[PDB]
Amino acid sequence: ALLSFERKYRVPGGTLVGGNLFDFWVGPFYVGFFGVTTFFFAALGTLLILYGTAMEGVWNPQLISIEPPSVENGLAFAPLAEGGLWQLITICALGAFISWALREVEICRKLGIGLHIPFAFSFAILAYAVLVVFRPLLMGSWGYAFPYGIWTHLDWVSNTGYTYGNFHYNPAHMLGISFFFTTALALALHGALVLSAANPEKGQEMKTADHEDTFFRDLVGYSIGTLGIHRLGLLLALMAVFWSAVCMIITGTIWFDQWSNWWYWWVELPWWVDIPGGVNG
Amino acid sequence: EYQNIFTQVQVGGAPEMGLVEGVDLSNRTKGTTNWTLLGWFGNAQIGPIYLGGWGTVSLISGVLWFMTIGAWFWYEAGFNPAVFMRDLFYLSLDAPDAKYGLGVPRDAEGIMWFIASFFMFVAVWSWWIRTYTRAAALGMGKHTAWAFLSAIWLWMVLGFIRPILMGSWSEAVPYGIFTHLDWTNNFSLTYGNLFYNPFHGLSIAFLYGSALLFAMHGATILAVSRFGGDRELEQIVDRGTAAERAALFWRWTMGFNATMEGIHRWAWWFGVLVTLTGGIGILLSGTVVDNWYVWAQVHGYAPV
Amino acid sequence: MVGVNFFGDFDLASLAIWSFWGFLAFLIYYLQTENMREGYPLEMEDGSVAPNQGLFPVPKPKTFKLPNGRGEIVMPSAENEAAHRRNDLALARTSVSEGFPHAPTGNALVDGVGPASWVPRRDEPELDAHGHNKIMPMALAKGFNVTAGRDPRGLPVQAADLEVVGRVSELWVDVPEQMVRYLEIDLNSGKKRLVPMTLAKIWADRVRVNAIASDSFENIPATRSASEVTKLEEDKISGYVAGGWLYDADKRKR
Amino acid sequence: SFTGLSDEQAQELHSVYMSGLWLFVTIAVIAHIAVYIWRPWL
Amino acid sequence: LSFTGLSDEQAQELHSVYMSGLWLFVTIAVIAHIAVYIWRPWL
Amino acid sequence: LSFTGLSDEQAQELHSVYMSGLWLFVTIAVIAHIAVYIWRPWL
Amino acid sequence: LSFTGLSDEQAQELHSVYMSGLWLFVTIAVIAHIAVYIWRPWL
Amino acid sequence: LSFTGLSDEQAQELHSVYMSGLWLFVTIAVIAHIAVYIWRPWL
Amino acid sequence: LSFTGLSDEQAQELHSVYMSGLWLFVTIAVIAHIAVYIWRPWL
Amino acid sequence: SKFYKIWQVFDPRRVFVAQGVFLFLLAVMIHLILLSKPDYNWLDVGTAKYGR
Amino acid sequence: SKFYKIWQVFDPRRVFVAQGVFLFLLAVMIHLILLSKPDYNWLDVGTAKYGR
Amino acid sequence: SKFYKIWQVFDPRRVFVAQGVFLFLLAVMIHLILLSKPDYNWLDVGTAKYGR
Amino acid sequence: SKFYKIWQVFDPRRVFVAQGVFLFLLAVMIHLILLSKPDYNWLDVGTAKYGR
Amino acid sequence: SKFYKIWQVFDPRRVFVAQGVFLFLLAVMIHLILLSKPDYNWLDVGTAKYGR
Amino acid sequence: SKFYKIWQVFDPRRVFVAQGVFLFLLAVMIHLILLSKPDYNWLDVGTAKYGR
Ligand code: BCL
Numbered sequence A: 001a002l003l004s005f006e007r008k009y010r011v012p013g014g015t016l017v018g019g020n021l022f023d024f025w026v027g028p029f030y031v032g033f034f035g036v037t038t039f040f041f042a043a044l045g046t047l048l049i050l051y052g053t054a055m056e057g058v059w060n061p062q063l064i065s066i067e068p069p070s071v072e073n074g075l076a077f078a079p080l081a082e083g084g085l086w087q088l089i090t091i092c093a094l095g096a097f098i099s100w101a102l103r104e105v106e107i108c109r110k111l112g113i114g115l116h117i118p119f120a121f122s123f124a125i126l127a128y129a130v131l132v133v134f135r136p137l138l139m140g141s142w143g144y145a146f147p148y149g150i151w152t153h154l155d156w157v158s159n160t161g162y163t164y165g166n167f168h169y170n171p172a173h174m175l176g177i178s179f180f181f182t183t184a185l186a187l188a189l190h191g192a193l194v195l196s197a198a199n200p201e202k203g204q205e206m207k208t209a210d211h212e213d214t215f216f217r218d219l220v221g222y223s224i225g226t227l228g229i230h231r232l233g234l235l236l237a238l239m240a241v242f243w244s245a246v247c248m249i250i251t252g253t254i255w256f257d258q259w260s261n262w263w264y265w266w267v268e269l270p271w272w273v274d275i276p277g278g279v280n281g
Numbered sequence B: 001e002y003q004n005i006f007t008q009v010q011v012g013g014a015p016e017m018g019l020v021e022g023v024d025l026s027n028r029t030k031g032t033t034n035w036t037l038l039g040w041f042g043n044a045q046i047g048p049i050y051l052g053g054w055g056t057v058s059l060i061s062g063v064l065w066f067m068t069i070g071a072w073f074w075y076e077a078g079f080n081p082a083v084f085m086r087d088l089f090y091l092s093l094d095a096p097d098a099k100y101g102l103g104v105p106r107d108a109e110g111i112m113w114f115i116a117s118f119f120m121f122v123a124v125w126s127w128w129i130r131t132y133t134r135a136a137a138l139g140m141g142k143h144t145a146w147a148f149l150s151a152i153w154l155w156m157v158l159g160f161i162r163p164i165l166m167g168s169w170s171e172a173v174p175y176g177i178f179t180h181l182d183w184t185n186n187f188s189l190t191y192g193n194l195f196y197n198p199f200h201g202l203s204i205a206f207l208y209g210s211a212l213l214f215a216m217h218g219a220t221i222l223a224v225s226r227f228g229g230d231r232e233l234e235q236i237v238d239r240g241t242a243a244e245r246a247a248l249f250w251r252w253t254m255g256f257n258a259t260m261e262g263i264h265r266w267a268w269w270f271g272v273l274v275t276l277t278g279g280i281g282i283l284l285s286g287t288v289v290d291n292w293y294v295w296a297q298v299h300g301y302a303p304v
Numbered sequence C: 001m002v003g004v005n006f007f008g009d010f011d012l013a014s015l016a017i018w019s020f021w022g023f024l025a026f027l028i029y030y031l032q033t034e035n036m037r038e039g040y041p042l043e044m045e046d047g048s049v050a051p052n053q054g055l056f057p058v059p060k061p062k063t064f065k066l067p068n069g070r071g072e073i074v075m076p077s078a079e080n081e082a083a084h085r086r087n088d089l090a091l092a093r094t095s096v097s098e099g100f101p102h103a104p105t106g107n108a109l110v111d112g113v114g115p116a117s118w119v120p121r122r123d124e125p126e127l128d129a130h131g132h133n134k135i136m137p138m139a140l141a142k143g144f145n146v147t148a149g150r151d152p153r154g155l156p157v158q159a160a161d162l163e164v165v166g167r168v169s170e171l172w173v174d175v176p177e178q179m180v181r182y183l184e185i186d187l188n189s190g191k192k193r194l195v196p197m198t199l200a201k202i203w204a205d206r207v208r209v210n211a212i213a214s215d216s217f218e219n220i221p222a223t224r225s226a227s228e229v230t231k232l233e234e235d236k237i238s239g240y241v242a243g244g245w246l247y248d249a250d251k252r253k254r
Numbered sequence D: 001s002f003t004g005l006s007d008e009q010a011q012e013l014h015s016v017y018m019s020g021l022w023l024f025v026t027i028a029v030i031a032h033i034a035v036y037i038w039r040p041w042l
Numbered sequence E, F, G, H, I: 001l002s003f004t005g006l007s008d009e010q011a012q013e014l015h016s017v018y019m020s021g022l023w024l025f026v027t028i029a030v031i032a033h034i035a036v037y038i039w040r041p042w043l
Numbered sequence J, K, L, M, N, O: 001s002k003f004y005k006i007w008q009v010f011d012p013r014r015v016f017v018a019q020g021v022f023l024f025l026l027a028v029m030i031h032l033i034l035l036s037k038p039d040y041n042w043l044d045v046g047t048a049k050y051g052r
């Protein structure tokens, strides 16, 4: 089970809750208090989804959908056949995600490395929460949360968006899209560069970071560096998720009209409003 | 307790001008500026840059593309700078009319679009060759070029290939900020719902995975930067405890792990697959499938 | 080719998605195999080769040609696993059964186990493309000065115990990347010791090192040379310092 | 203190500052009451 | 002083040239405002 | 004194020729403005 | 002084050639403008 | 004298062959333009 | 003289072969064009 | 007065640059204000006055 | 009073810069919110007063 | 009488490049203002004058 | 007549690649342009000619 | 005059590149402005002259 | 004349590749403009000439 170098690192310590208790491994996996808790929550949520689609009568995993309660039910707990199962699954998902992050914390402080990874995961956890907890609360009902189905939560996406015309015109949406695109670009380029240096042309010696900096300088005139590219991609992904959470928290709580009409304040600015010509004149 | 997000102390001396490994030192500039605002995050040295035939061609063609679009914008605004700055995001050099089919358009907007797209073609392919040659000169692999080729594949599918198969340049993308968003929306609407395209879903899977993976990887390196993790090329051949602790964090967390060389293959592939799958999906829309929701219904992931 | 099914409902889009499933299976195989050039073959807690070695086979060896005459590195290779192998570890089994922790027997910081672990890298410095040493003291880096930010040089070093152990003296800088890697400390005991910058936070009046206490600053591994630091020494130093976040927590205050 | 050399130069600097401010504010009040008579708001 | 290092002579020369330029600029501006007031008064 | 480093004489020569160019430019511009005002007045 | 380290003689012959080319370009443009005004005036 | 390092003799012969090529290109262009004007005039 | 590292005789050889290939290409293209013109003229 | 020391504190380069940019943008703003109004617009005013 | 010690702690240059920026923005906003007032717009007022 | 001294404060190259850019873009903006108005558009005015 | 010196300024291994790529793309563009025209589409015109 | 020292302040090759680029883009601007107007469009005007 | 000194300030490789791309793009653009106009489209003109 152990890698050639894993033994010296398997020591006691790095636990937030429990000590000697739950400080062991199941194969490669480290299981602590929060490993136990996240296993419990994940298994319970999986079994709840399976029982829900059994009740519905659907076993094609591409048609399984556990839908939330209705908008009329409000914030109340609904019949388990009418949305209570979605609610329990959401509770279990939150618990499992949080326990996964805290397990990562334990593992990090056992290995002696920084806590950047659970911090980065917390952003995705918080976006999921914005979607299923907070935005429903400000809107007054859990019926505005997305369903647990492979192709039905896409219907939720589409309808939630087209409730505001084209959702492309949300500005935080724009920022999130730009950051996602740039994150993918930067990841492709980083992989390409590291591999081009480490696996060079046939018959040539291995390269260094000098060659990488030189390639990107000759190409575009700037190299951010080995540490800079990592800081940059991390922050890019985090800002993408942050601006997505922003685009959604304001969508039906502070904005209610089509998002394309927001931009018409720059068109209605009193000094170029009635000039004739262009699209808006 | 120092997370290494920002640099505390900047140091610097003479500029790193580069390495001679096959490069023509005459085409490389001699000017460099250091900017400290970038030093708090990355490197501060701005420059130098290589100026050759392919970069010259690409610069010329891309400047002409930009300028053609801007000239149409100025015409559409009536030469009024105020209407230009007012309607900047609403102005557009739009793809030809359908009446022209695939022939050379017989309109001003359409021929302007045609010539701007010609310049775009030349610039993008010249830049691809630039990447290839800038790697070949330093004796580096061509992974950057093969990654750029996927984005070029999608861009081509959008502008050149699919308009041809579908039989009209009106299917291509216009040159405007809001108009190309409208183009995406109308594309999804014309062909059922593009969500129910499987290759669209795959492109999205890999886009999301790119951010998942870089968050994981950058957080990992910053977590093991205290052990020298950012120096990856030396960890690949002379493994240190940084690589081992990263691998072990991820093994203990989710059972499997990568190497310091091997996670960059994941990175490269998640990058290129976005645009590969997206290009295939855009090709299949209109040419093989007219509606994606009905296709999903027939193929078992949409209810009937 | 709309509504043109080769058989049944199978058209070019279904062909494409199934072809992609196949290509993706092959690609997962390739990536997981290429992720096996370190760490294998798998071991027991006794050090022996395990009955289970995985479901993907370890791939064929590739060769890395190194610059500066450093040679050729083959991955995977028994030579690479033997060179990077720690021997005579100071750990005791917590249990006879597998999957349980191994406890240090002495001072895990000095004995280099756990988060204080170090890998036996080559006792040779990391070089740049020209063949010079990558990390230098800034005195030996011709042209290098502090272009921005606070200069730590001369600042007192506060430890986890909130006690002071010395003053910063010199800065060890990555020359090709133009960044600080280690700051050297003049210990009040008359010794010089390196500490990574990533584990040191510059305040206006002090440099705070919360990883290790005042007791541990003395037993930090030293460099055989005062002008160069080897990969091995770097790994030992950084491991020692990091291990304090666990093994110096009872002393840590505030 | 924080400047390290203002212990007495601060007198000169505050003096010139006061003169400039006095000019500014006399001009401003002239304008204000001129506006008041031209168009009063209260 | 320690902020830019000049001296009273240097600063007086610079203020002389600066105020010459400023007086010229403002004279041009007042001439223009007078012409405009004649063309289209705004009191 | 001189943050740039130029001499007083070099600066005087620079400014002499600078004024030569500026006055040629303003001359052409004045002739053009007179021509236009005759062709299509604006005030 | 000479920010590009170029003499007065070199700069002078440089300007000579530059102005010769300038006047050639300009006179061709002038002939073109004469023709253009002749077949379709604009003022 | 030379930023590029070329000699006046080298530059002379280079400009000679360059102008040969340019005059060839221009002659072909002029012939083609005459042909097209006879074919379909535009001015 | 030379920036690529070639003699004058090397360049004469290279250009001779290049020009033979070029003239072959152009002869083929010319015959093709004559054919197309006879078949469907565009002029 | 004693105002000349403002140069003993400010860098003539930066302050001159900022002053120029500020003056230019201020004049642009004022001209554009005047043009925004059907009156005080000298172009349309001339169009009306000369009958063009 | 004894306010002459404000500069011992504060940097003169930064204080002057922020003061200038803030004063200009303030006067701009005052003039602008007057321009929005129909009765106080000196331009429209000069328009009404005279014939134009 | 003392403006020659400014060349000791500012670099001639930066000043000249900035001046060139500023003048070209200013002239362009003014020409476009004129061309955007039916009157002051010399091309339409000429098309009218000669009745073509 | 001294055009052989073009090979003293550029090296042929890159020039020939560029030239072949350029020529192929040019031929492709011209063939496509002609196919876009029913009159110079040789397939459709052969069809119409031979009665099929 | 003494304009020739403009070659002593800044460099010839940069200004020549900028001059080519600027003159080309400006000439294209003017040609396109003339084409935008049905009058001064020499192509359509020639079309109208010879009856085509 | 002395125009031959333009090679003492320009590298022939740079100017040649730039000039080539410039001329190719300009030619393609003019040809495309002509094809955009039903008149001056030599293909359609030949089509109508021979009655096809
Ligand atoms: C109403 C909107 C429709 C929709 C319609 C479309 C359409 C239509 C398309 C997609 C496409 C994509 N959509 Mg969408 N999309 C929808 C819903 C979504 C949702 C969501 C959560 O709702 C998500 C996450 C996505 C996600 C995505 C991406 C995964 C994918 C494009 C990847 C990419 O990088 O393209 C961006 C990358 C490029 C275009 C490559 C660019 C490369 C070139 C060479 C750039 C050269 C630069 C140039 C010369 C200028 C340089 C400037 C200077 C150098 C600075 N869409 C809905 C259903 N979407 C695209 C796709 O892949 O199709 C499957 C696509 O065409």
Ligand SMILES: COC(C)(C)C/C=C/C(C)=C/C=C/C(C)=C/C=C/C(C)=C/C=C/C=C(C)/C=C/C=C(\C)CC/C=C(\C)CCC=C(C)C
Binding pocket: F013, F014, F017, F018, F021, F022, F025, G001, J024, J027, J028, J031, J032, L019, L029, L030, N002, N003, N004, N005, N006, N008, N009
């Ligand atoms: C939007 O609102 C509108 C535009 C309608 C109204 C607004 C109008 C505004 C804001 C107008 C503003 C106008 C201004 C500020 C104009 C300023 C003009 C100036 C300063 C012009 C200067 C011109 C200078 C010239 C032409 C100089 C030429 C110089 C030479 C040819 C040589 C110079 C250099 C030499 C000789 C170097 C010699 C070297 C040595 C070493 C001696």
Ligand SMILES: COC(C)(C)C/C=C/C(C)=C/C=C/C(C)=C/C=C/C(C)=C/C=C\C=C(C)\C=C\C=C(/C)CC/C=C(\C)CCC=C(C)C
Binding pocket: B066, B067, B069, B070, B071, B073, B114, B117, B118, B120, B121, B155, B156, B157, B158, B159, B160, B172, B173, B174, B175, B176, B177, B180, M029
């Ligand atoms: C102030 O203004 C000035 C003039 C100074 C400058 C301003 C310029 C401005 C405002 C420019 C604005 C540009 C904008 C807004 C551009 C936006 C572009 C966008 C959003 C494009 C999006 C997608 C484009 C795609 C996918 C294009 C693909 C093109 C191709 C694949 C080209 C293929 C070739 C074609 C179609 C035919 C030509 C081929 C041949 C062989 C002739």
Ligand SMILES: COC(C)(C)C/C=C/C(C)=C/C=C/C(C)=C/C=C\C(C)=C\C=C\C=C(C)\C=C\C=C(/C)CC/C=C(\C)CCC=C(C)C
Binding pocket: G013, G014, G017, G018, G021, G022, G025, H001, L024, L027, L028, L029, L031, L032, N012, N019, N026, N029, N030, N033, O002, O003, O004, O005, O006, O008, O009
């Ligand atoms: C937007 O509004 C529109 C555009 C519609 C209207 C307004 C347009 C405006 C305001 C346009 C203004 C254009 C201006 C002011 C242009 C004025 C003059 C220019 C820039 C003329 C430059 C000509 C330069 C040329 C042709 C240079 C030729 C050079 C040579 C033949 C020789 C090159 C150098 C050599 C041979 C080296 C010399 C010797 C040694 C040893 C180095």
Ligand SMILES: COC(C)(C)C\C=C/C(C)=C/C=C/C(C)=C/C=C/C(C)=C/C=C\C=C(C)\C=C/C=C(\C)CC/C=C(\C)CCC=C(C)C
Binding pocket: K003, K004, K005, K006, K007, K008, K009
């Ligand atoms: C509807 O109403 C709502 C609820 C929205 C709010 C209602 C009521 C509120 C928010 C009331 C708030 C009242 C407050 C905040 C009162 C006090 C305000 C103060 C203290 C304002 C801030 C600054 C005042 C200053 C700086 C005034 C004078 C200070 C000085 C002259 C000290 C400068 C120091 C020097 C020169 C030190 C020199 C000496 C040495 C030894 C260096």
Ligand SMILES: [Fe+2]
Binding pocket: A190, A194, B221, B232
């Ligand atoms: Fe990396």
